[PDB]
Amino acid sequence: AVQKVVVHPLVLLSVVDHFNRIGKVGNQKRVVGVLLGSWQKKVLDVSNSFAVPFDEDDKDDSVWFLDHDYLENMYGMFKKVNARERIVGWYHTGPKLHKNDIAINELMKRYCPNSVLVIIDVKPKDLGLPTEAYISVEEVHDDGTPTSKTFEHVTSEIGAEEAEEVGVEHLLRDIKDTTVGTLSQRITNQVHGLKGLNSKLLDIRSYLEKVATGKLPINHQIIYQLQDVFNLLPDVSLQEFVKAFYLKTNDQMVVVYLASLIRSVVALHNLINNKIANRDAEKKEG
Amino acid sequence: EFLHAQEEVKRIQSIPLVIGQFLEAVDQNTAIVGSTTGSNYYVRILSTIDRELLKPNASVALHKHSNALV
Amino acid sequence: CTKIINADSEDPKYIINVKQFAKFVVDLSDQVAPTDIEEGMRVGVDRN
Amino acid sequence: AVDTAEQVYISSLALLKMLKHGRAGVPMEVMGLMLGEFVDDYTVRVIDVFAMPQSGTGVSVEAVDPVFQAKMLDMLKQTGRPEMVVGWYHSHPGFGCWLSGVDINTQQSFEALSERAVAVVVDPIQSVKGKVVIDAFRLINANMMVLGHEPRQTTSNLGHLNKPSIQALIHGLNYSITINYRKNELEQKMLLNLHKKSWMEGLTLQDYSEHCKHNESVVKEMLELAKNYNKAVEEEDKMTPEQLAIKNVGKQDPKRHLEEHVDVLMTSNIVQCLAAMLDTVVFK
Amino acid sequence: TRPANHRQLTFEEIAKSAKITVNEVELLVMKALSVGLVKGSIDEVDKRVHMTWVQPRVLDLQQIKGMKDRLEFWCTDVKSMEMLVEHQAHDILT
Amino acid sequence: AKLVRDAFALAKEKAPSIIFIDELDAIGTKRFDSEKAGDREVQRTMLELLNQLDGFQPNTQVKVIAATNRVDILDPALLRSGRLDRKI
Amino acid sequence: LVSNVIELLDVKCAVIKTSTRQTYFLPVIGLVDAEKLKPGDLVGVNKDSYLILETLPTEYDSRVKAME
Amino acid sequence: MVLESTMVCVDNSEYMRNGDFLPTRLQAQQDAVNIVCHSKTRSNPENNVGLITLANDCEVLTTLTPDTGRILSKLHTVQPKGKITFCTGIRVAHLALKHRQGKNHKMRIIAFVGSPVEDNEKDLVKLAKRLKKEKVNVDIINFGEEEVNTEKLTAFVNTLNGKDGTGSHLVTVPPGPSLADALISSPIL
Amino acid sequence: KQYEKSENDLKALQSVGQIVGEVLKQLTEEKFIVKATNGPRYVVGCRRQLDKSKLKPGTRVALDMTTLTIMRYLPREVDPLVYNMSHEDPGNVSYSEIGGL
Amino acid sequence: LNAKVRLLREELQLLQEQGSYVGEVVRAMDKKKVLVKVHPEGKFVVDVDKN
Amino acid sequence: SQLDCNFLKVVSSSIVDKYIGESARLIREMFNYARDHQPCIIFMDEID
Numbered sequence A: 001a002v003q004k005v006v007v008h009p010l011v012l013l014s015v016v017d018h019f020n021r022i023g024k025v026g027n028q029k030r031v032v033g034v035l036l037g038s039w040q041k042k043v044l045d046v047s048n049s050f051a052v053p054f055d056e057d058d059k060d061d062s063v064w065f066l067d068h069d070y071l072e073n074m075y076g077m078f079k080k081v082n083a084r085e086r087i088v089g090w091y092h093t094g095p096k097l098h099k100n101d102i103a104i105n106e107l108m109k110r111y112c113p114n115s116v117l118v119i120i121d122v123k124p125k126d127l128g129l130p131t132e133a134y135i136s137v138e139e140v141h142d143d144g145t146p147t148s149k150t151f152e153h154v155t156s157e158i159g160a161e162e163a164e165e166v167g168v169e170h171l172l173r174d175i176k177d178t179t180v181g182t183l184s185q186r187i188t189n190q191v192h193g194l195k196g197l198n199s200k201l202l203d204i205r206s207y208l209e210k211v212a213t214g215k216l217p218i219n220h221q222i223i224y225q226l227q228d229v230f231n232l233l234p235d236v237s238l239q240e241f242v243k244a245f246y247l248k249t250n251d252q253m254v255v256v257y258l259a260s261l262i263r264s265v266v267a268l269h270n271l272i273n274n275k276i277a278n279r280d281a282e283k284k285e286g
Numbered sequence B: 001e002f003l004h005a006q007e008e009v010k011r012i013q014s015i016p017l018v019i020g021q022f023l024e025a026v027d028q029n030t031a032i033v034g035s036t037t038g039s040n041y042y043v044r045i046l047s048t049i050d051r052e053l054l055k056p057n058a059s060v061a062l063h064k065h066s067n068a069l070v
Numbered sequence C: 001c002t003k004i005i006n007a008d009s010e011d012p013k014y015i016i017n018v019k020q021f022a023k024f025v026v027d028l029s030d031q032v033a034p035t036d037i038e039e040g041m042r043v044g045v046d047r048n
Numbered sequence D: 001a002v003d004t005a006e007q008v009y010i011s012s013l014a015l016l017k018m019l020k021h022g023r024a025g026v027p028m029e030v031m032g033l034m035l036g037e038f039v040d041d042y043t044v045r046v047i048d049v050f051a052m053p054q055s056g057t058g059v060s061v062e063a064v065d066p067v068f069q070a071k072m073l074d075m076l077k078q079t080g081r082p083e084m085v086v087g088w089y090h091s092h093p094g095f096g097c098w099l100s101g102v103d104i105n106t107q108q109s110f111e112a113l114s115e116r117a118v119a120v121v122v123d124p125i126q127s128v129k130g131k132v133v134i135d136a137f138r139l140i141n142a143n144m145m146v147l148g149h150e151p152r153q154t155t156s157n158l159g160h161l162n163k164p165s166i167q168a169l170i171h172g173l174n175y176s177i178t179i180n181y182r183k184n185e186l187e188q189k190m191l192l193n194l195h196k197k198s199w200m201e202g203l204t205l206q207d208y209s210e211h212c213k214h215n216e217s218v219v220k221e222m223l224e225l226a227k228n229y230n231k232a233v234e235e236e237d238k239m240t241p242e243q244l245a246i247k248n249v250g251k252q253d254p255k256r257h258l259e260e261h262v263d264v265l266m267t268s269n270i271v272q273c274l275a276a277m278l279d280t281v282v283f284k
Numbered sequence E: 001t002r003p004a005n006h007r008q009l010t011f012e013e014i015a016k017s018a019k020i021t022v023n024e025v026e027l028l029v030m031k032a033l034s035v036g037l038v039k040g041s042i043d044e045v046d047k048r049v050h051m052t053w054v055q056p057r058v059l060d061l062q063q064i065k066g067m068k069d070r071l072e073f074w075c076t077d078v079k080s081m082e083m084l085v086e087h088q089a090h091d092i093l094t
Numbered sequence F: 001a002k003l004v005r006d007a008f009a010l011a012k013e014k015a016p017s018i019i020f021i022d023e024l025d026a027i028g029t030k031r032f033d034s035e036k037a038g039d040r041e042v043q044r045t046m047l048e049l050l051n052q053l054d055g056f057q058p059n060t061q062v063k064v065i066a067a068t069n070r071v072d073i074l075d076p077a078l079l080r081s082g083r084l085d086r087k088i
Numbered sequence G: 001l002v003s004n005v006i007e008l009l010d011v012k013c014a015v016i017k018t019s020t021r022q023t024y025f026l027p028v029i030g031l032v033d034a035e036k037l038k039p040g041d042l043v044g045v046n047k048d049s050y051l052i053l054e055t056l057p058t059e060y061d062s063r064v065k066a067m068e
Numbered sequence H: 001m002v003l004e005s006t007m008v009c010v011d012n013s014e015y016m017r018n019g020d021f022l023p024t025r026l027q028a029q030q031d032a033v034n035i036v037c038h039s040k041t042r043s044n045p046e047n048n049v050g051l052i053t054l055a056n057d058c059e060v061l062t063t064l065t066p067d068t069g070r071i072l073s074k075l076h077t078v079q080p081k082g083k084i085t086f087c088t089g090i091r092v093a094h095l096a097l098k099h100r101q102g103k104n105h106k107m108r109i110i111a112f113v114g115s116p117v118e119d120n121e122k123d124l125v126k127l128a129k130r131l132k133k134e135k136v137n138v139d140i141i142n143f144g145e146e147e148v149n150t151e152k153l154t155a156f157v158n159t160l161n162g163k164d165g166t167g168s169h170l171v172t173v174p175p176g177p178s179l180a181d182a183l184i185s186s187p188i189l
Numbered sequence I: 001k002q003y004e005k006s007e008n009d010l011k012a013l014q015s016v017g018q019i020v021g022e023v024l025k026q027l028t029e030e031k032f033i034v035k036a037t038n039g040p041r042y043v044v045g046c047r048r049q050l051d052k053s054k055l056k057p058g059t060r061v062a063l064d065m066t067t068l069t070i071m072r073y074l075p076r077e078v079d080p081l082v083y084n085m086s087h088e089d090p091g092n093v094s095y096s097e098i099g100g101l
Numbered sequence J: 001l002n003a004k005v006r007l008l009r010e011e012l013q014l015l016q017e018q019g020s021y022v023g024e025v026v027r028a029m030d031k032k033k034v035l036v037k038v039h040p041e042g043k044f045v046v047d048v049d050k051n
Numbered sequence K: 001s002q003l004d005c006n007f008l009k010v011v012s013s014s015i016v017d018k019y020i021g022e023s024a025r026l027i028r029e030m031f032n033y034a035r036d037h038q039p040c041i042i043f044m045d046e047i048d
């Protein structure tokens, strides 16, 4: 029962290093380990991670090996190095959450009562999905469905911790996408937001197409019981707005007349002084 | 670059700070300030700060590793 | 410099009051036999 | 057999781990052995680093307790690589970035084990905001007496920028191995505004009632700036212009109170209108 | 069944679709609100009623075609606006 | 403070004994005070002694008697009820 | 660094003064125990961490010792 | 001395509760243990041991270790409840063995096939067709339930060999509840 | 049970402790001027979760030793001193021990 | 605008160097030696810069 | 004996100071003290 999960920038680098280290000697295209954090409240700040040997058999995708002995040994050493970290879940790449998901969650649940698995990719940036968090709740069903694995999603956001924010600041020190160049950045933000909305709507469209063609089961219970209501408040007020959008004029009064007047007068005065100075200097030179 | 630099200079007046007293003033960009410790120091003064609120005595903060009037 | 306010018998630990800084619990250096060090005498405690 | 202007490359994760471990125990002092690869005679690279539980009287030869040293390096190879131990964390909370006689005694043994190993010093207190005080050190050879000035050489190449610091001069000095951070493109793809980009929150209109209050709060004082500008425009009437126009203090108007205000007002009042009108057509 | 634009309906419609009296219509709508199936509002002098929903129901494949079409039109419009902004602002975007 | 705390200490230790605070006129003087209060530590010491005296029930047996060559200046609190009460 | 406990809170807690007149709160009581404690008892603390290491035997300064 | 590691597939099936060799059957799987490998380390003190269950798709209860206390402790709690699994059970052990240290150690899987299996006919393709190129060794122990001689299981060793192999042997101790001497003496290993 | 009492024993051997100080003013919604018992003064604020409650211009806070952000509340100490004029005993007296008045 | 990126840049570096102490000199000894008196601590025989 | 039971407030002397500020501080401190409980009545004796 977690409202949100926050990842410390050290963990993302941890996963990226793991993927590079293995893939330099690997081709299975899946690095999987178990992380540690502090389940202080509804929020769970995963703050560090390690590795664990993991091999999986492509036949049936159901034969594998996770060295729980490695689990205990690694955790013991990390406990000696610091006692404030508790094992709270695992991590793995390969956005294609493979079959042995609930199985591994079962195996690792013998070290936590509320284990939460956050999936970390090593690639995309166009959208804003650096990671997503999943939980293994086996609530049987509602309505009339049979039981199943029924993994679930927990909201996530990449966090920070002082003395590490400094590290990242230095490590980047080039893009510096802060309020620098504020007007240009605001326009780029409006463009990027439109692109993101396009992408999300397109994903919804693809799912709707796939469900209508019958390829996938109709998730009446929750998937579209919310899409309909969302479709139900695409603000359509187009009768009194014709007069409710004179607040645009209220903004425009300032943002046009006052700003343009001030900048025009200032520029005129600056030109006046510069020309006067240069003319006097040239005249006096000879 | 300039915008980043202004942000960086602004980022010096935050965080924990230590209180002291503006004992006396010297050439601009510099002054002498007391301290909560009681070991009156010599400090450099941030330019962006005001000038009409620097009373002969006053409560001012100082950087922990710089003891600069921020 | 520092004084000694106790010398735990059969326990090598000693307690000293330096002067104005604070009190402490100290170990006796190997170079000095415990018998040569008593209660109330002035000891040459080192820094660090 | 001679040093030069040599570059030590610390991985991004390595730097992050150094800083986190240092700050976790700031009041005390910490120690952490370094794993890396001895690239070549002028390139020592450390890929990742690992910490050693805070035991003993402090940073000393006790951090190398074999029982713990062997078992980590072991299990670590099982998954990843054996990069041989190359250096150590160390940490001086409020003591600049110096090396003391005990530290020299320690690093002497590590030098013996290796031939060119390095000793890092990461300051967890002073280094904040936008400062990294991570300086790398090596033990000057005991044959100081008379030799080519230092083992630095510096005759091979001119890389010497970022000359020696201040405190190290006061304390034991004369190496200061130059440090250069490697950053894979992917490693910075994340750790980027992935750390704070926005996600889709640009198409937010901002509290409208708040906007109409901020705008008045700004324009009302723009009026005062205008009054001051008039006053300062009557000035320059040939009394002592060259000197006076520069000696007049008070945040000259069209540089800190009439220009910045116009620039902020423009940006805010335009972004608001753009967002409003964009949403007027995105949603139907 | 109304196309989400003219949700304001008239008591005549409720009566003809509910075989209840004109007078009783207001009570029926008030009961609906009270139970909590709609969240509109009731007005008289205009002889109309204003609705707004929070209780959605099940659907069928044919009814999903309308939703798909609405989404497709919305996506086309969003793409158009994004392209317009990107093209016009191209001078200052970078 | 440590001196007084201990002095009334080691009295429960070696339970049978009686304490005599000679020249009490100095350790406790009438409740004059300094606006600076930097030289007011003696008042803290006297209050500590008073507290010790208060925290004492006739079940325990460690008596205290003291002399004051000038009863005039003694703080009119060390004579309240259960602290030094009998006068000779 | 010899010290004492002054205001045991239990909100399991402590408030330690030192011979350096440094009043410092403690997050967790020392590696000792919550019963072997009382409002004032010489207990050692670490040089910087300021935990509560082994308690101490009540010893009297010479100034008061030489008064029997 | 020992050019081999050790992993064991200790059955856990629902049928494992039965009087066929002793108290409650499995009570005997536990029986060899204390010799099921006690004998294997009765070898140079550098042998390696393991443990793998085979019910409910089977988990792993021990990672290769020159220790036995852990394997015994896990054995104490092996409650039998569920249908036996194989093929997948053997492949899990195979992977675990691949993750063995001291490459000098050869592989060995001692299969305590008790309760009946559901394996199809030509399971050999995955059951044995690999161990050759992987130079693996598998041993089969039939805890009774020898349905029609379980030629299906015998075919595993049959696929083994091809010239030389079989490990020690696929010994099916008779349903006579004699003991584990049959798993103590019979195994020359 | 011994292992249990040892695990927490070693685990607690990490805590570093705070500095006991009394807040003085309320500079901003996130900047509160705070002093220390020793005497030096500082400027700090809540950590990330403190209720930002009353914290009147007097109260006990245990600031951190590195960042110094206020960490926790703390009630008044009342060290044995002039600080204990409080002897409200509610109801254990009657005219049963009067002097005839 | 290059002026700004310097008149505001160099100020940061020259604002992060350890400050100075304030003291009272007494009896300048032989040239290149003085006897200052710091506030909390005792008198130090400080040197003299080249300026 | 009444429903006050709170009488004690041993005399009143500590409110003596050299400026009205400290007296106002002490009196509001005691007033809040009284406000703490049910009707509180403050003994004012011990004056010279």
Ligand SMILES: [Zn+2]
Pocket (backbone or CB within 6 Å): D059, D090, D091, D092, D099, D100, D103
């Ligand atoms: Zn050091």
